[PDB]
PDB file of C-alpha atoms in Angstrom:
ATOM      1  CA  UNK A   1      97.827  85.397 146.606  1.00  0.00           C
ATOM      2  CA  UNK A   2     100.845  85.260 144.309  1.00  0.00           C
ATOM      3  CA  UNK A   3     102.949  88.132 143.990  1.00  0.00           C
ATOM      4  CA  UNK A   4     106.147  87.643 143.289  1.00  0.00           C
ATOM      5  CA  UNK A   5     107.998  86.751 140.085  1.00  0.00           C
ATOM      6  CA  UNK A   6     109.459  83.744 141.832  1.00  0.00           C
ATOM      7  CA  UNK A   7     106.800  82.112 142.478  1.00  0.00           C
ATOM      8  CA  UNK A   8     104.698  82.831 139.132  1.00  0.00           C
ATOM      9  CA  UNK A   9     107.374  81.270 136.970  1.00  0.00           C
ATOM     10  CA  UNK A  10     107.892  78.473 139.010  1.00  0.00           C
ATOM     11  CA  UNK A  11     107.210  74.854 137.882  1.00  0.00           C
ATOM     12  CA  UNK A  12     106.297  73.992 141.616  1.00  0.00           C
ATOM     13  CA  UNK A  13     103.404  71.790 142.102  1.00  0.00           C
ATOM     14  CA  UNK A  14     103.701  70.782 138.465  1.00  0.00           C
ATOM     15  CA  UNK A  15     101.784  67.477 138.623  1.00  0.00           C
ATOM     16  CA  UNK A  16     101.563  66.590 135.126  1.00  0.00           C
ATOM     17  CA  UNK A  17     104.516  63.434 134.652  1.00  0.00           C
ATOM     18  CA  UNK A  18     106.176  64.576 131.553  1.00  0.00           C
ATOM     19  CA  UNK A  19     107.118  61.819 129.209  1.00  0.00           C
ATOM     20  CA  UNK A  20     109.301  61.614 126.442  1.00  0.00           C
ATOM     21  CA  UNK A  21     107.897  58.385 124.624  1.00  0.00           C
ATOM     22  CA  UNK A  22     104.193  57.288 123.247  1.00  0.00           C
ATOM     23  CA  UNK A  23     103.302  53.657 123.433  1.00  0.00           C
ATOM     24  CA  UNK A  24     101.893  52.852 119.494  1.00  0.00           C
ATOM     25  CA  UNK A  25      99.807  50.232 118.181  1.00  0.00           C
ATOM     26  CA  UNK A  26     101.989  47.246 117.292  1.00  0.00           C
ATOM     27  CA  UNK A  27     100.108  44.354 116.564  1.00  0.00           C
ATOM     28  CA  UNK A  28     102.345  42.884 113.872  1.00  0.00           C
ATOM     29  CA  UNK A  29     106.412  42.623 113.226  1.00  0.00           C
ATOM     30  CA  UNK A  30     107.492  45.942 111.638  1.00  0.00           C
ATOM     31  CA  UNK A  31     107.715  45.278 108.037  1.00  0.00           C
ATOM     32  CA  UNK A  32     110.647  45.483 105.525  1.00  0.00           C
ATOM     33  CA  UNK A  33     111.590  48.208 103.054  1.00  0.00           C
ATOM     34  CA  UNK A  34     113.138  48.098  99.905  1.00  0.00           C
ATOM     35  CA  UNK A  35     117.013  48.851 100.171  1.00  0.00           C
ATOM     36  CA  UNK A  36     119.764  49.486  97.453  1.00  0.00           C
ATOM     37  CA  UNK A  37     123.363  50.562  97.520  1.00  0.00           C
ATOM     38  CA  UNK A  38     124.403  53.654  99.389  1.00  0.00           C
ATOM     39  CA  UNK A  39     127.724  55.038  98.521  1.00  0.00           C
ATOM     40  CA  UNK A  40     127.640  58.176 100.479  1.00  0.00           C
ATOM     41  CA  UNK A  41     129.762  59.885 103.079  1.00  0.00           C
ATOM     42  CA  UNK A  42     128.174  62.357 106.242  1.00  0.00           C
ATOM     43  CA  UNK A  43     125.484  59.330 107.273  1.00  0.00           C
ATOM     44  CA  UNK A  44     127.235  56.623 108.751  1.00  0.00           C
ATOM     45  CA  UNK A  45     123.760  54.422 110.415  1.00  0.00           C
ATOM     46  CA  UNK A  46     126.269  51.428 112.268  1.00  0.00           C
ATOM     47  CA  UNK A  47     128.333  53.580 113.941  1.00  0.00           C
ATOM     48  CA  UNK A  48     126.687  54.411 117.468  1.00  0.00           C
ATOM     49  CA  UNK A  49     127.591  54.978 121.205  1.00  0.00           C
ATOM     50  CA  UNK A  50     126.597  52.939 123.506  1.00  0.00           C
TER      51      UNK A  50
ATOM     52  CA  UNK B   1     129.753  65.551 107.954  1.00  0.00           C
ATOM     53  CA  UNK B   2     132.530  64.652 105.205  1.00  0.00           C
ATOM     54  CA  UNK B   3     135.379  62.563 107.265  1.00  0.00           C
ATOM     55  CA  UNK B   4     132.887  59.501 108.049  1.00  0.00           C
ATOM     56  CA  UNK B   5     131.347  57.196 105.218  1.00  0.00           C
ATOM     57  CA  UNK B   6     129.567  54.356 104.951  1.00  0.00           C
ATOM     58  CA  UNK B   7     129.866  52.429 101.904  1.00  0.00           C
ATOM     59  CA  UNK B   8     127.018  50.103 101.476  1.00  0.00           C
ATOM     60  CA  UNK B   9     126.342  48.100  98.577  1.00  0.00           C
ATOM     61  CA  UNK B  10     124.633  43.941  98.622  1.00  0.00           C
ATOM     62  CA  UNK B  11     125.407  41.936 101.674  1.00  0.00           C
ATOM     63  CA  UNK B  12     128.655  44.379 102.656  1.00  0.00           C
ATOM     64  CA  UNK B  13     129.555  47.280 104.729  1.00  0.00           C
ATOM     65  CA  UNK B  14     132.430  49.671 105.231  1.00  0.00           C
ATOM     66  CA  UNK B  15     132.326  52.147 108.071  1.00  0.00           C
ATOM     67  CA  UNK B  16     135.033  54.561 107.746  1.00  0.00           C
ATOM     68  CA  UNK B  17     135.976  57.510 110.548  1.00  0.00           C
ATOM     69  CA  UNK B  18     138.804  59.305 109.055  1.00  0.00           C
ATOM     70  CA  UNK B  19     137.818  59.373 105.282  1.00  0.00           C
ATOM     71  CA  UNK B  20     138.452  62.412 102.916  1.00  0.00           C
ATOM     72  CA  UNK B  21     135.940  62.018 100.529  1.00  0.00           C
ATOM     73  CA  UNK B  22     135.396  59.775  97.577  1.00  0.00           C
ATOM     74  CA  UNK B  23     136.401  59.953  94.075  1.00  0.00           C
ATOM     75  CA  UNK B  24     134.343  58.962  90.538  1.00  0.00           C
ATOM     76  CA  UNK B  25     136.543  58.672  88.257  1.00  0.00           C
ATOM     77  CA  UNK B  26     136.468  61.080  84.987  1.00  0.00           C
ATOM     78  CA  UNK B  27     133.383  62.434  86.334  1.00  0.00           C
ATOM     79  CA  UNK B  28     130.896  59.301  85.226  1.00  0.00           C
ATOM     80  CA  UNK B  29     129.098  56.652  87.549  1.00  0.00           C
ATOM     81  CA  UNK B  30     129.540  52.977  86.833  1.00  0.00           C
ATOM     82  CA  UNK B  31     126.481  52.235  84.333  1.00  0.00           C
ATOM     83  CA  UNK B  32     124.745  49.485  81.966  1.00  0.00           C
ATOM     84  CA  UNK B  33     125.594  49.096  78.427  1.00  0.00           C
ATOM     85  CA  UNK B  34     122.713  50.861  76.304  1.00  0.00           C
ATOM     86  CA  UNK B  35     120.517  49.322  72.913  1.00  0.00           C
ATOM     87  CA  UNK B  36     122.482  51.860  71.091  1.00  0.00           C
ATOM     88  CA  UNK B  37     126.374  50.733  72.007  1.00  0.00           C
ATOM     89  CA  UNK B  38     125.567  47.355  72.366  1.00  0.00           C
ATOM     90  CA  UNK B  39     125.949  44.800  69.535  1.00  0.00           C
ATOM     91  CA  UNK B  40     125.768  41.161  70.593  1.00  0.00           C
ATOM     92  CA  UNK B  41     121.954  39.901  70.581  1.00  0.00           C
ATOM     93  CA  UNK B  42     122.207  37.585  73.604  1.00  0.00           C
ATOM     94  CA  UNK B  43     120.347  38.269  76.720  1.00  0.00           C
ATOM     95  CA  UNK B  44     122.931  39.715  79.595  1.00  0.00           C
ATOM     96  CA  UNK B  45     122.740  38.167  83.012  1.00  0.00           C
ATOM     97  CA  UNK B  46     122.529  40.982  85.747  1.00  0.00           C
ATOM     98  CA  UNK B  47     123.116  39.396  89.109  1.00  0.00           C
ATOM     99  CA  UNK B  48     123.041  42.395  91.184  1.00  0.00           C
ATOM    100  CA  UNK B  49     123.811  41.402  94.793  1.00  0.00           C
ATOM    101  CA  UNK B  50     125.875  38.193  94.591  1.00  0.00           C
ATOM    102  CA  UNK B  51     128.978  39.941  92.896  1.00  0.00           C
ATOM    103  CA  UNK B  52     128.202  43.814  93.282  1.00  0.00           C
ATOM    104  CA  UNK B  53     129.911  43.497  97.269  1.00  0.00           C
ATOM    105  CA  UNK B  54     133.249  43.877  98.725  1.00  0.00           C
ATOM    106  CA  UNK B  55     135.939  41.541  97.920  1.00  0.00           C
ATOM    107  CA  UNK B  56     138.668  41.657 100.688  1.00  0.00           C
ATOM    108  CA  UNK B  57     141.650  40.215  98.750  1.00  0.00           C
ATOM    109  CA  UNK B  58     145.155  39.928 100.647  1.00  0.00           C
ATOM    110  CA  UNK B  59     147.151  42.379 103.053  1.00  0.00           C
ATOM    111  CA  UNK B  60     150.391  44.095 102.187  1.00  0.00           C
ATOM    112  CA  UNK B  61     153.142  45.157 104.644  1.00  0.00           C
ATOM    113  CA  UNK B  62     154.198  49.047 104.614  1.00  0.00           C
ATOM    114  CA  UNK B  63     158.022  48.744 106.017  1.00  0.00           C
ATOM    115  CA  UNK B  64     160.767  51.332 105.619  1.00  0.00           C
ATOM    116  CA  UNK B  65     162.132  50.106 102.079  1.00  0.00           C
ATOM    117  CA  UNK B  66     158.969  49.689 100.418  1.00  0.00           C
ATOM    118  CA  UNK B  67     158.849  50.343  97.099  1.00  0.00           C
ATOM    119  CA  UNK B  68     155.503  49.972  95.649  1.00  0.00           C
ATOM    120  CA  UNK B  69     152.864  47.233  94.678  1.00  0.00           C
ATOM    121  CA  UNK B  70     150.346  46.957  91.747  1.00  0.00           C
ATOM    122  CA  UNK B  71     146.929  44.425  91.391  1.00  0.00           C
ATOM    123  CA  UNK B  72     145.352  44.291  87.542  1.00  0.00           C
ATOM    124  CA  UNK B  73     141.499  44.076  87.273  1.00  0.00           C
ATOM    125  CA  UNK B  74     139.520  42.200  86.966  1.00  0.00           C
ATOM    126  CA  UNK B  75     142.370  39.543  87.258  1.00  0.00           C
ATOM    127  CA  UNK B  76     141.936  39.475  91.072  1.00  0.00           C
ATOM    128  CA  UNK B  77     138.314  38.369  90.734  1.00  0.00           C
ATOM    129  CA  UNK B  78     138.836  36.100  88.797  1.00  0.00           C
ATOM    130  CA  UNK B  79     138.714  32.727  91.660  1.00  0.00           C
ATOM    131  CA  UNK B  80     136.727  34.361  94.365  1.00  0.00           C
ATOM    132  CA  UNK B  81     133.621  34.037  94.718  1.00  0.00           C
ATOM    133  CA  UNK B  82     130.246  34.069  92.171  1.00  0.00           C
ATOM    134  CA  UNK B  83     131.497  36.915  90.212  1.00  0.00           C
ATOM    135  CA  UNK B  84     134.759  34.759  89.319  1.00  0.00           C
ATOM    136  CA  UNK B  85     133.114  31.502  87.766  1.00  0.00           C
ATOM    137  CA  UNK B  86     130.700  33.394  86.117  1.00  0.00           C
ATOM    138  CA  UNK B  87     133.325  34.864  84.384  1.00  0.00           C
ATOM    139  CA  UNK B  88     135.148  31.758  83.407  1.00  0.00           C
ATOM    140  CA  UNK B  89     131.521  30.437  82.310  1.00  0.00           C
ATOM    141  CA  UNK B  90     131.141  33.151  80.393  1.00  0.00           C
ATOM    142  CA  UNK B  91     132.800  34.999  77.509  1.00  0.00           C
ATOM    143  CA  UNK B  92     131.969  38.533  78.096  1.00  0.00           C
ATOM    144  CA  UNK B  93     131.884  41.100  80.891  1.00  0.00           C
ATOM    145  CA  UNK B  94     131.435  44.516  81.974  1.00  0.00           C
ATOM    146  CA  UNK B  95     131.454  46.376  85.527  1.00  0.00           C
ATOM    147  CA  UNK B  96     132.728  49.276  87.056  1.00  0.00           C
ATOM    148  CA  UNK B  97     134.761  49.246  90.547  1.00  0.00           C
ATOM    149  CA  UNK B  98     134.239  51.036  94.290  1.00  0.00           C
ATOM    150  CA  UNK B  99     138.297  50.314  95.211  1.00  0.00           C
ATOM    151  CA  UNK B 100     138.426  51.026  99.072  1.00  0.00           C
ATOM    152  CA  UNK B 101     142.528  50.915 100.194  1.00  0.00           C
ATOM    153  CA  UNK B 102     142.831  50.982 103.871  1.00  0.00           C
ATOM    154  CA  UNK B 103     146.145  51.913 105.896  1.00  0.00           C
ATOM    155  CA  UNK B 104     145.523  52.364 109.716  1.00  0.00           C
ATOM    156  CA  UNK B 105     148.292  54.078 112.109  1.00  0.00           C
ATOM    157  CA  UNK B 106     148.736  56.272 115.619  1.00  0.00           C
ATOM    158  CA  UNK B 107     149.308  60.154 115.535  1.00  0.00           C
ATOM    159  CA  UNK B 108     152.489  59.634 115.797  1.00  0.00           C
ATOM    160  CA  UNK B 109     153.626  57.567 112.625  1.00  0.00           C
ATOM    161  CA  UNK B 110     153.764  59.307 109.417  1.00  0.00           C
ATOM    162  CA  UNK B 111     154.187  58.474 105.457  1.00  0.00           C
ATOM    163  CA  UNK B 112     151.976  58.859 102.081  1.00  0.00           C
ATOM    164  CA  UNK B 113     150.507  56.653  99.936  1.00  0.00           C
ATOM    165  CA  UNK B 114     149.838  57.391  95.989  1.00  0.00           C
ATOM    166  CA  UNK B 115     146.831  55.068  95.165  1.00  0.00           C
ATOM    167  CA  UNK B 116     145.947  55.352  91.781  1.00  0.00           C
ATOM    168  CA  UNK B 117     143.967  53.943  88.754  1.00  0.00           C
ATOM    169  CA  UNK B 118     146.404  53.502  85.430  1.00  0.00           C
ATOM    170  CA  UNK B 119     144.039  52.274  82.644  1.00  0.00           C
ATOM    171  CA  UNK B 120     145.747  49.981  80.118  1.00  0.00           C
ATOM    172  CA  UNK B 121     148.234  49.278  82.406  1.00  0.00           C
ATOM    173  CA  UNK B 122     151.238  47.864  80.274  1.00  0.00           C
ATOM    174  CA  UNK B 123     154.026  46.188  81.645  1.00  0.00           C
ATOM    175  CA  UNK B 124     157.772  46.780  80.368  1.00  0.00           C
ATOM    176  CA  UNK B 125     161.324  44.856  80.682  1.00  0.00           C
ATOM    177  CA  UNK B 126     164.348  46.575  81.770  1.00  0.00           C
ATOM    178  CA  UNK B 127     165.192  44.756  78.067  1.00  0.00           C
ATOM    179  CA  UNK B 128     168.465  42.752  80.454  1.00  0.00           C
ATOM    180  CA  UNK B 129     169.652  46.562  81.317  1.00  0.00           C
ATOM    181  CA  UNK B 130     172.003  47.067  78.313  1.00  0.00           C
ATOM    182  CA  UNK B 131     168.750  47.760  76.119  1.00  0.00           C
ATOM    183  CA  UNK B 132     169.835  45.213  73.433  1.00  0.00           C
ATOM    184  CA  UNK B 133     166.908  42.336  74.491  1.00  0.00           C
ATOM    185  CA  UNK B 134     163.401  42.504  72.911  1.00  0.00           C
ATOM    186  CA  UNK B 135     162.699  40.528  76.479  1.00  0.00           C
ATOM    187  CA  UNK B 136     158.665  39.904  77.580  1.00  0.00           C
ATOM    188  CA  UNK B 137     157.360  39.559  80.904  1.00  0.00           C
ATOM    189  CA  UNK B 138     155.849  36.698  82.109  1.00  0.00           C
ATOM    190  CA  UNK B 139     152.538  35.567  82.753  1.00  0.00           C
ATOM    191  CA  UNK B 140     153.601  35.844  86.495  1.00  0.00           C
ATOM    192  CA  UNK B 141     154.053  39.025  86.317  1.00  0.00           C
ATOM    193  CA  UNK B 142     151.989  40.502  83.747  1.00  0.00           C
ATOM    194  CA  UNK B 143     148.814  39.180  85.425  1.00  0.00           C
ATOM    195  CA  UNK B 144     150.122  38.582  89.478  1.00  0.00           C
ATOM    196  CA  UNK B 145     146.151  38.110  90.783  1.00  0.00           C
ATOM    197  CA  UNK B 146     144.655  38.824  94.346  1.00  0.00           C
ATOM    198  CA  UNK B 147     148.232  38.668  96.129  1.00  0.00           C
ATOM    199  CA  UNK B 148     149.676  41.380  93.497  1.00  0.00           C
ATOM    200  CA  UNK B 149     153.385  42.076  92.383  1.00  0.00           C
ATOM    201  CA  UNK B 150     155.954  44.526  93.847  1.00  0.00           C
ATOM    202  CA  UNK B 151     157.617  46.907  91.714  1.00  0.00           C
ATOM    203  CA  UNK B 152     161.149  46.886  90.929  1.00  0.00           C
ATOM    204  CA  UNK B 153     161.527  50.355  89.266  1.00  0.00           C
ATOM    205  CA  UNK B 154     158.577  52.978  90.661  1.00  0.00           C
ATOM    206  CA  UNK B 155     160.056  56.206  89.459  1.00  0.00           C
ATOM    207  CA  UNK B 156     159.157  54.777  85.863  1.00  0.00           C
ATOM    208  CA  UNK B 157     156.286  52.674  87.288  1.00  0.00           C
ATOM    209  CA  UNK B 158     157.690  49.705  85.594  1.00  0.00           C
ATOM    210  CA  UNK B 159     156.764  51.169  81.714  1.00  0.00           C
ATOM    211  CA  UNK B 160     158.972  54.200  81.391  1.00  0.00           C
ATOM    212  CA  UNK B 161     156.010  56.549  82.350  1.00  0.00           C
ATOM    213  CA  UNK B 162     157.034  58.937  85.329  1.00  0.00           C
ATOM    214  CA  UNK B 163     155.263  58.105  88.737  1.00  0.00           C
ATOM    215  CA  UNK B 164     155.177  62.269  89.217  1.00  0.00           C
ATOM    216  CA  UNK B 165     152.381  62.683  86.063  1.00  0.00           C
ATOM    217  CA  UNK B 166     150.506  59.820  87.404  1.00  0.00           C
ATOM    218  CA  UNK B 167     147.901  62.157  89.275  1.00  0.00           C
ATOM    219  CA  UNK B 168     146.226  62.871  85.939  1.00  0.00           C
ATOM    220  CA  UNK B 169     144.650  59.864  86.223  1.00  0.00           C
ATOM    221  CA  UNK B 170     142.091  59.266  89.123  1.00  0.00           C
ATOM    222  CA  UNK B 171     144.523  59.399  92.999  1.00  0.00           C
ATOM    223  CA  UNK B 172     143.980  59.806  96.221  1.00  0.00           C
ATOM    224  CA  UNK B 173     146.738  60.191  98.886  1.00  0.00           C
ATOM    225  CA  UNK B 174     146.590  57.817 102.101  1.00  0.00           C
ATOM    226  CA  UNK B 175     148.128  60.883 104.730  1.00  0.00           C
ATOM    227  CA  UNK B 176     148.516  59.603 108.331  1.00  0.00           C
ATOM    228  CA  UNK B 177     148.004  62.398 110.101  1.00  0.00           C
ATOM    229  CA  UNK B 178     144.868  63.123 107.739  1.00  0.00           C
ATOM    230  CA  UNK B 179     143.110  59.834 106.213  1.00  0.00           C
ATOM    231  CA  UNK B 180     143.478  56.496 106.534  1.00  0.00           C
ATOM    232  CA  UNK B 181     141.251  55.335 103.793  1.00  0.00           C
ATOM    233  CA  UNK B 182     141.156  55.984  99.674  1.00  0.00           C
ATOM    234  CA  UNK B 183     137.727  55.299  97.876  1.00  0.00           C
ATOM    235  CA  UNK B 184     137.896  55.779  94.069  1.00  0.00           C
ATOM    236  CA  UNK B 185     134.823  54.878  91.900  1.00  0.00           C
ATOM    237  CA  UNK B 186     135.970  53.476  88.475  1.00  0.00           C
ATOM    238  CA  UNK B 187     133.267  53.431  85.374  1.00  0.00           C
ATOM    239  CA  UNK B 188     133.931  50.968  82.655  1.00  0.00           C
ATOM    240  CA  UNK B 189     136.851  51.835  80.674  1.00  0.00           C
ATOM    241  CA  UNK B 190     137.002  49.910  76.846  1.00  0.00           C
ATOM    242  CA  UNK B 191     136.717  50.715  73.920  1.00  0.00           C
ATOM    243  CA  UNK B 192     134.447  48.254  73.213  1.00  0.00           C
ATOM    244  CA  UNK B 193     131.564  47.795  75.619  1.00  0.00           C
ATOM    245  CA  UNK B 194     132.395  44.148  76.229  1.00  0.00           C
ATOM    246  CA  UNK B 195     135.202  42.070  77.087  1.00  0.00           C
ATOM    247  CA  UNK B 196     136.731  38.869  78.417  1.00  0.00           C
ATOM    248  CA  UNK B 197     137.899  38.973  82.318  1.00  0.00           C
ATOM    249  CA  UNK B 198     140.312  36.513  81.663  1.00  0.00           C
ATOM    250  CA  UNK B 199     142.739  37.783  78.745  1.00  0.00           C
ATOM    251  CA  UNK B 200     142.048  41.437  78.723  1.00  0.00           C
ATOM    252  CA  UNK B 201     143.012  43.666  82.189  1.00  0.00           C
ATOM    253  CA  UNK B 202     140.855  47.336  82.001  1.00  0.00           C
ATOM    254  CA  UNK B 203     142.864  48.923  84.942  1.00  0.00           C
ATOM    255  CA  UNK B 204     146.008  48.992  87.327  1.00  0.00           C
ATOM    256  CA  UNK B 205     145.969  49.970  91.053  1.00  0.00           C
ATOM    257  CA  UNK B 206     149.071  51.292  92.076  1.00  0.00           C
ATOM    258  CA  UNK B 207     150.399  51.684  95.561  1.00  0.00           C
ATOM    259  CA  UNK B 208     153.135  53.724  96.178  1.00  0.00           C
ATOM    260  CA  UNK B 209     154.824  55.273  99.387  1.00  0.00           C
ATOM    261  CA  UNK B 210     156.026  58.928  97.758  1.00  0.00           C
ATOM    262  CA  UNK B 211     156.560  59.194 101.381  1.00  0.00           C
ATOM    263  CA  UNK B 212     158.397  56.935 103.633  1.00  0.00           C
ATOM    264  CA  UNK B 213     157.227  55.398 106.719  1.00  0.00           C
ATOM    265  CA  UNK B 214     158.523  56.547 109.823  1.00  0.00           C
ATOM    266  CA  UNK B 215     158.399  55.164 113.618  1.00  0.00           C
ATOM    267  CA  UNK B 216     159.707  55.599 117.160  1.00  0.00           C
ATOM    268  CA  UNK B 217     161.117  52.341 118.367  1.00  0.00           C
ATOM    269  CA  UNK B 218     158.128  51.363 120.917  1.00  0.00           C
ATOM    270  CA  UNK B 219     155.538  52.148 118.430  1.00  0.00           C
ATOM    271  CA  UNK B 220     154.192  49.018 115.941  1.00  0.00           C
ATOM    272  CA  UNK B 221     156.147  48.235 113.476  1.00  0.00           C
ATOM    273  CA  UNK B 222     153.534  45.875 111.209  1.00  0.00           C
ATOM    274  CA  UNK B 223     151.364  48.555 109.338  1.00  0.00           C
ATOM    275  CA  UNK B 224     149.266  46.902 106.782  1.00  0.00           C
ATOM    276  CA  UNK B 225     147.399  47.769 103.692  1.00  0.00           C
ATOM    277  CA  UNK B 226     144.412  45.895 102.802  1.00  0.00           C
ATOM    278  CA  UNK B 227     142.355  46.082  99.274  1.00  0.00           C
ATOM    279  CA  UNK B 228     138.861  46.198  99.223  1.00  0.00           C
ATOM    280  CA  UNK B 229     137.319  46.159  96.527  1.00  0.00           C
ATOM    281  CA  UNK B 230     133.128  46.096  94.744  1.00  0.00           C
ATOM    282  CA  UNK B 231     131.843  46.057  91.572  1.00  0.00           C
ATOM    283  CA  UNK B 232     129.096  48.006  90.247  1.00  0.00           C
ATOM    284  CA  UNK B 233     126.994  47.477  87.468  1.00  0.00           C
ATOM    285  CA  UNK B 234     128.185  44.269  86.048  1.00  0.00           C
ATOM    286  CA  UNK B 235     127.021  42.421  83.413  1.00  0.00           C
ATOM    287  CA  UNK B 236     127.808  39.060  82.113  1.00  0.00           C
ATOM    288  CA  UNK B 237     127.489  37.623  78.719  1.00  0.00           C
ATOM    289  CA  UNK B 238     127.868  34.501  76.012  1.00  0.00           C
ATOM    290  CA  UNK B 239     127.284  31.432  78.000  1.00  0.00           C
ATOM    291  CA  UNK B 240     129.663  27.963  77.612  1.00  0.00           C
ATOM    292  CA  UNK B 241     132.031  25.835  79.730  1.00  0.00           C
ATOM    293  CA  UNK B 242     134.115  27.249  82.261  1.00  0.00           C
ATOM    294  CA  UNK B 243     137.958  27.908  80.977  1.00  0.00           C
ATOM    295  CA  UNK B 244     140.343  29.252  83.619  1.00  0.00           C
ATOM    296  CA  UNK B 245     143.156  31.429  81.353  1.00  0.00           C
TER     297      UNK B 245
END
């Protein structure tokens, strides 16, 4: 007997273990691509944050 | 998404974090020689990884009384690496350049670099002063290689040509407070669309302060400037022994 908006909106007794990953099939070492020259500004891939 | 680049080409890598953009000069990419242009029969060897990288050459000091420096291509090539004996052991070449000049300081140094591309590059005498002396500079000088030569006169850039009219060719300004990186993308400049590496020089790279440096006491005083330097696109071409100059 729910009645109230607080208690209709509410994620309480929300079970369900959210994940933010999915294990994939990897049988096999990833596999190379093809790579040429990039000469580019904006994308910088080897600057991170650790 | 325009300050940070990374400059990628064979085994090499630049990361940059304070770039302005970069520049290809006159509007054309570096390229291969066509069927139509091209007129000698033998088969060009492309090696396309093992001299298209960055070359890191030698490191210049910026102090208060600087005056200027210039480096001719491809003579600083020329004994580094597998593009330089391919060129002595062969007779013919063509590439383009990625030039990447770095200059690193705080927020609280200042000063401007000109960094530009001069094609054809000719060198003049100050004929003993008096102007009477049909005088010649030397090989020394002419052709200085990887650790460059400093100029005596850079109003008149050495050749009686004003440094102020020199942004007409391809520039970019080195700004402390704004950059501290210049990337200019040369194309092949001849009028033929082969030549030898070792007699004939396509291009200067001047570097000039227009701007002074200027420090605090406290601060560092060593502020260095370091070429770096790919080609692109080169081709090789006539095969026989290996000749130095």
């Amino acid at each position: 007997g729910d009645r109230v908006a607080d208690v209709i909106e509410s994620s309480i007794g929300d079970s369900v273990s959210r994940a933010l990953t999915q294990a994939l099939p990897a049988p096999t070492g990833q596999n190379t691509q093809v790579s040429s020259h990039r000469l580019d500004t904006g994308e910088v891939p080897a600057l991170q944050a650790a | 998404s325009d300050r940070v680049a990374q400059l990628t080409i064979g085994n090499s890598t630049i990361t940059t974090q304070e770039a302005a953009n970069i520049i290809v000069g006159y509007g054309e990419w570096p390229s291969y020689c066509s069927d139509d242009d091209a007129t000698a029969v033998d088969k060009p060897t492309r090696p396309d990884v093992s001299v298209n990288r960055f070359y890191t050459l030698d490191t210049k000091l910026w102090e208060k009384s600087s005056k200027g420096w210039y480096w001719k291509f491809p003579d600083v090539l020329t004994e580094t690496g597998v593009f330089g004996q391919n060129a002595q052991f062969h007779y013919l070449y063509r590439s383009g350049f990625c030039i990447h000049v770095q200059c690193n300081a705080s927020k609280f140094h200042q000063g401007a670099l000109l960094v530009a591309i001069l094609p054809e590059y000719v060198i003049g005498t100050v004929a003993g002063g008096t102007g009477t002396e049909d005088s010649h500079p030397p090989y020394k000088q002419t052709q200085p290689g990887a650790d460059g030569f400093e100029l005596q006169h850079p109003y008149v850039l050495d050749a009686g040509i004003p440094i102020s009219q020199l942004t007409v060719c391809h520039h970019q300004r080195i700004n402390l407070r704004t950059n501290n990186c210049a990337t200019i993308i040369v194309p092949y400049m001849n009028t033929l669309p082969f030549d030898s590496a070792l007699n004939h020089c396509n291009f200067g790279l001047l570097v000039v302060p227009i701007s002074p440096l200027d420090f605090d006491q406290g601060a560092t005083p060593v502020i260095p400037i370091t070429i770096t330097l790919a080609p692109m696109c080169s081709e090789f071409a006539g095969l026989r022994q290996a000749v130095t100059q």
